[PDB]
Amino acid sequence: PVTLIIKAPNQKYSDQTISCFLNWTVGKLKTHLSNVYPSKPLTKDQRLVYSGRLLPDHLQLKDILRKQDEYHMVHLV
């Protein structure tokens, strides 16, 4: 799968390498994070910020994460 590196807001937790598919949207992945992340953060408040920009839950990961494909560091907010 794709190495989707979920780093915490203040880097409270380290770089989390989530082996997941770009098939899903930011919403389905963020639900998946709220399950597989040991803090289990509020899906309603939490969003994914990729290298400065905001990833909305309606679009598929692939569209933004196509460029490198291999690995992507996203900051949780």
PDB file of C-alpha atoms in Angstrom:
ATOM      1  CA  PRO A   1       0.000   0.000   0.000  1.00  0.00           C
ATOM      2  CA  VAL A   2       0.910   3.737   0.131  1.00  0.00           C
ATOM      3  CA  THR A   3       2.985   5.005   3.097  1.00  0.00           C
ATOM      4  CA  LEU A   4       0.740   7.810   4.476  1.00  0.00           C
ATOM      5  CA  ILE A   5       2.795   9.458   7.233  1.00  0.00           C
ATOM      6  CA  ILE A   6       0.329  10.969   9.777  1.00  0.00           C
ATOM      7  CA  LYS A   7       2.290  13.377  12.024  1.00  0.00           C
ATOM      8  CA  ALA A   8       0.545  14.849  15.149  1.00  0.00           C
ATOM      9  CA  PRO A   9      -0.397  18.689  15.485  1.00  0.00           C
ATOM     10  CA  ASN A  10       2.651  19.553  17.719  1.00  0.00           C
ATOM     11  CA  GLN A  11       4.373  16.255  16.675  1.00  0.00           C
ATOM     12  CA  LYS A  12       3.055  14.997  20.087  1.00  0.00           C
ATOM     13  CA  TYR A  13       3.183  11.503  18.575  1.00  0.00           C
ATOM     14  CA  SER A  14       5.945  10.696  16.005  1.00  0.00           C
ATOM     15  CA  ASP A  15       5.590  10.164  12.210  1.00  0.00           C
ATOM     16  CA  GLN A  16       2.863   7.428  11.890  1.00  0.00           C
ATOM     17  CA  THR A  17       3.409   5.352   8.708  1.00  0.00           C
ATOM     18  CA  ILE A  18      -0.171   4.276   7.822  1.00  0.00           C
ATOM     19  CA  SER A  19       0.036   1.650   5.030  1.00  0.00           C
ATOM     20  CA  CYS A  20      -3.272   2.505   3.267  1.00  0.00           C
ATOM     21  CA  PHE A  21      -4.735   2.933  -0.254  1.00  0.00           C
ATOM     22  CA  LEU A  22      -5.331   6.217  -2.169  1.00  0.00           C
ATOM     23  CA  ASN A  23      -8.589   4.487  -3.325  1.00  0.00           C
ATOM     24  CA  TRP A  24     -10.568   6.014  -0.382  1.00  0.00           C
ATOM     25  CA  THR A  25     -11.354   9.673   0.282  1.00  0.00           C
ATOM     26  CA  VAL A  26      -9.827  11.822   3.070  1.00  0.00           C
ATOM     27  CA  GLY A  27     -13.083  11.135   5.038  1.00  0.00           C
ATOM     28  CA  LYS A  28     -12.889   7.278   4.889  1.00  0.00           C
ATOM     29  CA  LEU A  29      -9.131   7.441   5.684  1.00  0.00           C
ATOM     30  CA  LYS A  30      -9.728   9.861   8.613  1.00  0.00           C
ATOM     31  CA  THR A  31     -12.373   7.419  10.019  1.00  0.00           C
ATOM     32  CA  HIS A  32      -9.728   4.668   9.533  1.00  0.00           C
ATOM     33  CA  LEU A  33      -7.210   6.916  11.449  1.00  0.00           C
ATOM     34  CA  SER A  34      -9.663   7.561  14.336  1.00  0.00           C
ATOM     35  CA  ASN A  35      -9.703   3.704  14.611  1.00  0.00           C
ATOM     36  CA  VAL A  36      -5.970   2.792  14.025  1.00  0.00           C
ATOM     37  CA  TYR A  37      -4.414   5.837  15.839  1.00  0.00           C
ATOM     38  CA  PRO A  38      -3.918   5.065  19.647  1.00  0.00           C
ATOM     39  CA  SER A  39      -5.246   8.532  20.680  1.00  0.00           C
ATOM     40  CA  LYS A  40      -8.478   7.929  18.617  1.00  0.00           C
ATOM     41  CA  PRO A  41      -9.086  11.694  17.838  1.00  0.00           C
ATOM     42  CA  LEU A  42     -12.508  13.422  17.176  1.00  0.00           C
ATOM     43  CA  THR A  43     -13.175  12.732  13.415  1.00  0.00           C
ATOM     44  CA  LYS A  44     -15.624  15.739  13.358  1.00  0.00           C
ATOM     45  CA  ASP A  45     -12.899  18.250  14.508  1.00  0.00           C
ATOM     46  CA  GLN A  46      -9.837  16.568  13.002  1.00  0.00           C
ATOM     47  CA  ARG A  47      -8.701  17.307   9.436  1.00  0.00           C
ATOM     48  CA  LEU A  48      -5.681  16.365   7.253  1.00  0.00           C
ATOM     49  CA  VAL A  49      -3.237  19.166   6.181  1.00  0.00           C
ATOM     50  CA  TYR A  50      -0.763  18.111   3.424  1.00  0.00           C
ATOM     51  CA  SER A  51       2.410  20.270   3.215  1.00  0.00           C
ATOM     52  CA  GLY A  52       0.407  23.473   3.989  1.00  0.00           C
ATOM     53  CA  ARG A  53      -2.936  22.822   2.174  1.00  0.00           C
ATOM     54  CA  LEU A  54      -6.222  21.397   3.617  1.00  0.00           C
ATOM     55  CA  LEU A  55      -7.491  17.986   2.341  1.00  0.00           C
ATOM     56  CA  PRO A  56     -11.411  18.005   2.355  1.00  0.00           C
ATOM     57  CA  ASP A  57     -13.219  14.662   2.972  1.00  0.00           C
ATOM     58  CA  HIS A  58     -15.174  14.707  -0.382  1.00  0.00           C
ATOM     59  CA  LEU A  59     -12.158  14.084  -2.740  1.00  0.00           C
ATOM     60  CA  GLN A  60     -10.002  10.923  -3.060  1.00  0.00           C
ATOM     61  CA  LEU A  61      -6.434  10.868  -1.604  1.00  0.00           C
ATOM     62  CA  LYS A  62      -4.958   9.916  -5.027  1.00  0.00           C
ATOM     63  CA  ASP A  63      -5.678  13.376  -6.602  1.00  0.00           C
ATOM     64  CA  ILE A  64      -3.234  15.166  -4.184  1.00  0.00           C
ATOM     65  CA  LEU A  65      -0.998  12.152  -3.389  1.00  0.00           C
ATOM     66  CA  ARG A  66      -0.442  11.140  -7.072  1.00  0.00           C
ATOM     67  CA  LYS A  67       2.761  13.260  -7.470  1.00  0.00           C
ATOM     68  CA  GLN A  68       5.191  11.085  -5.428  1.00  0.00           C
ATOM     69  CA  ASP A  69       2.675   8.227  -4.830  1.00  0.00           C
ATOM     70  CA  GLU A  70       5.283   6.260  -2.715  1.00  0.00           C
ATOM     71  CA  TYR A  71       5.195   8.227   0.645  1.00  0.00           C
ATOM     72  CA  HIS A  72       3.400  11.444   1.888  1.00  0.00           C
ATOM     73  CA  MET A  73       3.818  13.385   5.223  1.00  0.00           C
ATOM     74  CA  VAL A  74       0.392  14.785   6.286  1.00  0.00           C
ATOM     75  CA  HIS A  75      -0.030  16.858   9.501  1.00  0.00           C
ATOM     76  CA  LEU A  76      -3.185  16.185  11.605  1.00  0.00           C
ATOM     77  CA  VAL A  77      -5.069  19.265  12.993  1.00  0.00           C
TER      78      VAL A  77
END
